[PDB]
Amino acid sequence: MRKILVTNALPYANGPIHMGHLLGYIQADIWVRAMRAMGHDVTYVCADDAHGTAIMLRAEANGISPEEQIANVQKEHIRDFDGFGVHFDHYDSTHSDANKARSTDIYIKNREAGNIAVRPVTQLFDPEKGMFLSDRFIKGTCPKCKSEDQYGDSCEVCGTTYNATELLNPRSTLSGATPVEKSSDHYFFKLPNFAEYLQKWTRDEGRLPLSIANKLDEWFEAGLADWDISRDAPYFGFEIPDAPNKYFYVWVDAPIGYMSSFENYIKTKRPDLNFDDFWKKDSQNEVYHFIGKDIVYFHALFWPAMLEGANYRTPTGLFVNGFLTVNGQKMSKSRGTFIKAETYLQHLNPEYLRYYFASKLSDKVEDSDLNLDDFVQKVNSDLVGKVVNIASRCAKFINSSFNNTLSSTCAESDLVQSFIDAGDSIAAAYEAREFSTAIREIMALADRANQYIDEKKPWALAKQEGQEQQVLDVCSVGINLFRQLAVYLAPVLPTLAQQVQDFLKLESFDFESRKQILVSHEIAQFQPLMQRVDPKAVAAMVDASK
Numbered sequence: 440m441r442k443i444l445v446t447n448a449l450p451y452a453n454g455p456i457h458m459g460h461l462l463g464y465i466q467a468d469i470w471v472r473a474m475r476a477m478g479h480d481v482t483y484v485c486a487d488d489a490h491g492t493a494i495m496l497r498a499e500a501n502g503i504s505p506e507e508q509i510a511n512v513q514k515e516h517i518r519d520f521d522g523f524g525v526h527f528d529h530y531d532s533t534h535s536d537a538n539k540a541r542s543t544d545i546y547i548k549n550r551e552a553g554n555i556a557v558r559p560v561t562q563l564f565d566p567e568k569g570m571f572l573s574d575r576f577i578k579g580t581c582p583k584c585k586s587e588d589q590y591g592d593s594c595e596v597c598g599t600t601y602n603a604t605e606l607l608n609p610r611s612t613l614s615g616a617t618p619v620e621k622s623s624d625h626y627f628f629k630l631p632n633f634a635e636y637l638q639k640w641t642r643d644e645g646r647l648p649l650s651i652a653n654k655l656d657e658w659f660e661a662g663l664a665d666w667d668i669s670r671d672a673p674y675f676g677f678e679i680p681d682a683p684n685k686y687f688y689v690w691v692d693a694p695i696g697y698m699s700s701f702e703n704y705i706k707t708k709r710p711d712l713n714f715d716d717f718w719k720k721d722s723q724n725e726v727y728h729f730i731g732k733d734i735v736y737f738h739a740l741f742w743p744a745m746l747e748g749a750n751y752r753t754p755t756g757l758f759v760n761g762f763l764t765v766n767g768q769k770m771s772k773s774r775g776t777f778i779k780a781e782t783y784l785q786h787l788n789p790e791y792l793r794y795y796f797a798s799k800l801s802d803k804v805e806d807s808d809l810n811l812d813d814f815v816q817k818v819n820s821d822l823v824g825k826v827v828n829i830a831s832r833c834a835k836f837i838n839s840s841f842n843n844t845l846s847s848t849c850a851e852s853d854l855v856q857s858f859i860d861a862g863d864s865i866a867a868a869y870e871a872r873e874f875s876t877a878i879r880e881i882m883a884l885a886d887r888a889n890q891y892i893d894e895k896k897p898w899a900l901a902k903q904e905g906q907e908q909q910v911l912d913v914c915s916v917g918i919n920l921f922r923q924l925a926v927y928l929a930p931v932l933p934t935l936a937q938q939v940q941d942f943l944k945l946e947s948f949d950f951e952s953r954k955q956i957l958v959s960h961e962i963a964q965f966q967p968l969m970q971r972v973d974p975k976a977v978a979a980m981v982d983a984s985k
């Protein structure tokens with residue numbers, strides 16, 4: 440009865456999608472597809488994160504306006520997401536008019552509720568560029584440990600936090616020039632007004648993964664502070680109402696893009712839904728954000744406080760994932776492991792990576808390692824050599840000898856029913872984001888199917904007097920077992936699933952449809968459904984990434 444709204448983190452419009460970021464997008468897409476295959480009403484949206492100084496820097500580097508820069512990168516991101524089967528219902532932009540309006544609405548409601556303060560602050564200013572400098576565009580000497588080259592917010596060597604004005608001998612990263620100190624009025628969101636609210640919110644059952652417990656404990660012990668939400672002109676972003684020449688910091692309007700992408704989606708595709716159905720405080724529907732562990736603070740503290748302050752509902756849960764390593768090391772251009780999503784697609788089948796990720800993904804916030812030799816072996820053994828070969832080895836006889844038509848009865852009803860009944864556990868694993876468990880359970884079923892075929896030996900039956908019906912019965916069971924496997928893998932391998940729908944002539948492929956055992960059922964001529972992963976193609980991708 441409850442409908443679900445799901446998002447992925449919004450990528451910045453300042454560069455391409457890389458293979459490491461695909462982990463969370465593929466995780467979310469698998470979940471959405473599996474939940475839909477189980478009959479849930481799931482809406483799935485994303486958008487480009489379009490604002491901020493970093494995006495202005497890229498635009499100028501590329502000789503174009505910010506508006507043309509974000510238009511270019513949005514098309515690139517959509518291209519890459521689509522290439523990996525990450526299919527959103529809608530892909531928008533934080534620059535949209537819908538997001539401008541909702542940003543103003545949330546700000547003004549918070550301002551009138553008492554959650555906004557304005558005050559003059561001392562800020563570093565680049566005199567060459569005529570720009571006030573935010574913390575990530577200032578470097579200097581940490582006042583505590585005296586280490587060079589630290590940004591304006593905190594030191595990586597000793598961990599001290601500070602205002603950028605406490606750095607010794609600072610520099611602007613925009614020009615290298617020495618900044619000067621000036622005054623600028625800044626707008627602050629009064630996050631401390633929500634300390635007790637968030638201490639309860641972050642600990643509600645299902646809101647956050649259990650591992651984030653200690654990380655939040657640190658955060659609440661350290662104490663919440665007013666959040667600086669304004670940026671001075673020049674800034675590519677939304678102007679703050681009644682604050683001339685002041686803009687919302689990109690992170691204010693970025694999560695609002697979740698609302699606005701959804702809002703623009705339902706305006707064309709779900710006339711049965713309205714915005715309040717998901718975002719009014721009395722909503723009975725669910726909202727989930729898939730996000731990396733590096734942005735949990737924005738999503739677990741800033742975001743629900745801003746929503747609560749504006750009388751909107753808050754996310755039901757944050758699904759948090761770790762990072763991807765490659766061959767047991769951080770991804771580097773020098774090792775050719777900082778791989779653009781576009782480069783992978785120029786050399787390899789995307790469903791290789793969907794499967795490999797699924798076989799390792801769990802509900803835990805952990806880093807996943809992509810060992811490239813293991814990637815080749817795992818995908819080839821599991822999919823090409825085991826799962827797809829079950830169809831091949833059974834279809835061989837049905838296509839060649841039995842007019843492409845499965846037997847009129849199921850000769851192993853209990854065995855097939857046992858594969859059907861295993862769907863309940865597989866569905867529960869997908870829903871719990873325990874993808875590695877779902878894959879293991881499916882592969883255990885594939886082993887049982889090969890065990891059955893090996894026991895019956897259709898190749899021997901085809902060479903024995905009078906066993907024609909038994910060859911057909913056995914191969915028909917094998918195809919039915921394969922069909923169950925492909926239904927269960929469909930959230931992970933949607934293209935393979937479409938191909939199996941064509942091969943088995945099946946219009947429906949959701950979980951309910953699997954209860955229909957195929958009998959007297961014409962199938963198409965079998966053709967290979969997946970090529971093996973070629974190690975040279977993997978190496979060509981690595982070499983193209985150096």
Ligand code: MET
Binds near residue numbers: 693694
């Ligand atoms: C509202 S999610 C925004 C995520 C941000 N663009 C990032 O890359 O970290």
Ligand code: NA
Binds near residue numbers: 759760800801803804
């Ligand atoms: Na995980």
Ligand SMILES: [Zn+2]
Binds near residue numbers: 581582586597598
């Ligand atoms: Zn330090």
